[PDB]
């Protein structure tokens, strides 16, 4: 029984967005690639290398034209004619634009591909941009986070397969089930915020009672996400704030990698 094809291309990626799949449980990465999809291209896991894997890519783009989901992690560097990422002697922006032509759906997994992320921060040495900026006439589904919970991606792909269309998206093309609400508008430490019960330093008495991390720099008030509800790793209770560290805003353009850890958020 045939599985829906997926082409995965890394640009200026750190591989964290692929590594998120190795923590997934529904599906596990082995069930993803054996049962859920046909992963037609992914350089991290591919048996083939070099000329053989460039054959696989060209064969897949032709065989599955109009049918595959294209996934990109990393930012795409446009400075100096694309040379800050060169694969098989050609700029990765050209590989991505070629793959985009035949895509049924296109997903930017992680903050780097969704909005430029850390690679486009500060002075932006390589002129790194988002996948949507490289594909202006295409609808890019953005799954931000550094990396996102892998199921923010997997349940988006499942919605496409099972129901034949993307999940509902916000005005930044982010799936609403994962990004529809501010973290601070669904955070279990909001009672402590409301009461003025704040950690002032790691290890202080408030910190050691699980009080609100706003005055440590928590960016929950200005970051859309599901980190407080879905959390991470499916063990229960695991997200940065629950472990004792403020949200850094890694989901949200202009917050993560721009504002200092301890810089205070604006509150709506």
């Amino acid at each position: 029984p045939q599985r829906p094809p997926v082409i995965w291309i890394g640009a200026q990626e750190c591989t964290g967005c692929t590594e998120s799949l190795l923590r997934a449980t529904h599906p596990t990465v082995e069930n993803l690639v054996l049962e859920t999809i046909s992963l037609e291209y992914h350089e991290v896991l591919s048996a083939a290398f070099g000329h053989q894997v460039e054959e696989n890519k060209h064969n897949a783009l032709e065989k599955y034209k109009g049918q595959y989901v294209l996934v990109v992690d990393g930012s795409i560097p446009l400075k100096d004619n694309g040379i800050y990422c060169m694969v098989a002697g050609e700029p990765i922006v050209d590989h991505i634009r070629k793959a985009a032509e035949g895509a049924a759906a296109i997903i930017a997994i992680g903050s780097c591909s969704a909005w430029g992320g850390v690679a486009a921060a500060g002075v932006n040495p390589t002129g790194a941009v988002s996948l949507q900026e490289v594909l202006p006439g295409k609808t890019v589904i953005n799954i931000p986070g550094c990396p996102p919970n892998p199921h923010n991606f997997l349940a988006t792909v499942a919605h496409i397969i099972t129901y034949g269309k993307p999940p509902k998206l916000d005005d930044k093309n982010r799936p609403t089930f994962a990004y529809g609400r501010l973290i601070h508008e669904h955070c279990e430490r909001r009672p402590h915020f409301d009461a003025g019960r704040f950690a002032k330093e790691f290890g202080d008495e408030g910190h050691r009672e699980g009080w609100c991390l706003y005055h440590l720099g928590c960016k929950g008030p200005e970051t859309y996400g599901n980190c407080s509800t879905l959390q991470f790793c499916d063990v229960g209770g695991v997200w940065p704030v629950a472990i004792g560290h403020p949200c850094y805003g890694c989901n949200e353009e202009g917050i993560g990698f721009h504002k200092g850890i301890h810089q205070l958020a604006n509150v709506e």
Partner: protein
Amino acid sequence: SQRITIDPVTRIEGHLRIDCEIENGVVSKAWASGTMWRGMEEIVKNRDPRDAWMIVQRICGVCTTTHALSSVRAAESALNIDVPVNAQYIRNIILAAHTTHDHIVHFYQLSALDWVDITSALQADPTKASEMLKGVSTWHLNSPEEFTKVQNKIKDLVASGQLGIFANGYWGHPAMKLPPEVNLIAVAHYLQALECQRDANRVVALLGGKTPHIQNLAVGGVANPINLDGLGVLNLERLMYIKSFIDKLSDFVEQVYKVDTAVIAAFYPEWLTRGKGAVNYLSVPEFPTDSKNGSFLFPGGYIENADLSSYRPITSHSDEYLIKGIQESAKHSWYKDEAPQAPWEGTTIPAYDGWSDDGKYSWVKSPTFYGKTVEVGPLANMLVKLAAGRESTQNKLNEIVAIYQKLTGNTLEVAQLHSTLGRIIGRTVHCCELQDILQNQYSALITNIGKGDHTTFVKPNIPATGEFKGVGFLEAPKGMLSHWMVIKDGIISNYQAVVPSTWNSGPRNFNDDVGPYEQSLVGTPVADPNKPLEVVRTIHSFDPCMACAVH
């Protein structure tokens, strides 16, 4: 004779090109090239020292945790902060559990398909496969029934005609030497490895707040709030949960990964006689356990010209001999400033001019130690522990050699470890010894909290004037890592990462001396220059990480 390019090299982290001249069917000369740069050292410049770790952790998501830990250690070095011992225990558990995930995934998901022919596993007799492991392993998932289920998953994938990432692989290559039964065993273990690595990352997550990219560090310690009696913080229930995952790792590591390492050596014994990358090796001590950033569980050192008997121990991350030897050159790299640079004085000025065999051909810099090329990573790490007379490392290597002996009638000497397979063996030995690190540091944490020490964080002060230099060393899964921070007028005025894949993958250096990857390939037999499996076998042994190498 001819010139080949392998681009992309798959089953690594990031973007690598390998070029080789082949003469009389053997590699005569090679080029290693990192083909993607981000400028992470420039992105972190001008920021508050406390912010660096969250940014530079994103150098790499495979070796997540490592750049975060090296960054806080660099700021702590510059600022003269002694990390609380509970913060060391937590940092150590994270690094040990992460490294366990990292090595398992390297051996199975990244490397196994260089040595394993999945098509050949379809010809296996699952009962004969199971019979081959009697008195070789006590693992509980080597039954014929397990192997038949795995063989049926291979059968179903092939039947679908959608091989995807298994497509157009090196099936039937003459360098593929495993019997059908051993191929099937390896695929069953590949799938079982995914469960073990998942458990290892549940340890990481419960202390880090997630993984990839932990979020529990600080310049001055950790953000975990220790309170056995606290709701919503790191209490005894949470610690028990961590322990439940630590306990799940040992059996797979000891009874599957360790045994498979011996079995691959037994079937590929010529790979103990090729893939030497260097004659000099470096590792740093790791897992500090005192209140002053020292008392390491694992030792470090420097080996010169493969002489274990006269190696130089390294017992401190403040060792001036280690600090003063490290330089990087960009003569054959796409940066402007070419003379060897000490990292506190490093620049990273891009100067891309395209590929030239005798000019610039990589985004990776060329590191040296007092002017010499050095291999880092598990082979270095293992050889330094053997030089130190570490009984745990001796004993663990001897267990792998005893399985090799049982299967072949032959033994393994230290000379054979300077090789593609020795490198793989050093990684497996590291993974096995890390399970004792985890038990040791869990116990130390429980004991210390029981004495009434719940401290985790020392708030830093950063003088608004003055220039302060710090270096953070870490023995990462791929080898010695260092982050070099200069603070001036309260902000980062220079940041330089010298990463273990930089040492190994870096191009020809200021003296045109050849780095470990390029050296290791000389003499590689290549049966089929269009399908150079043998080259990728040696390169994978180093566990390349090119986001790490280039940053």
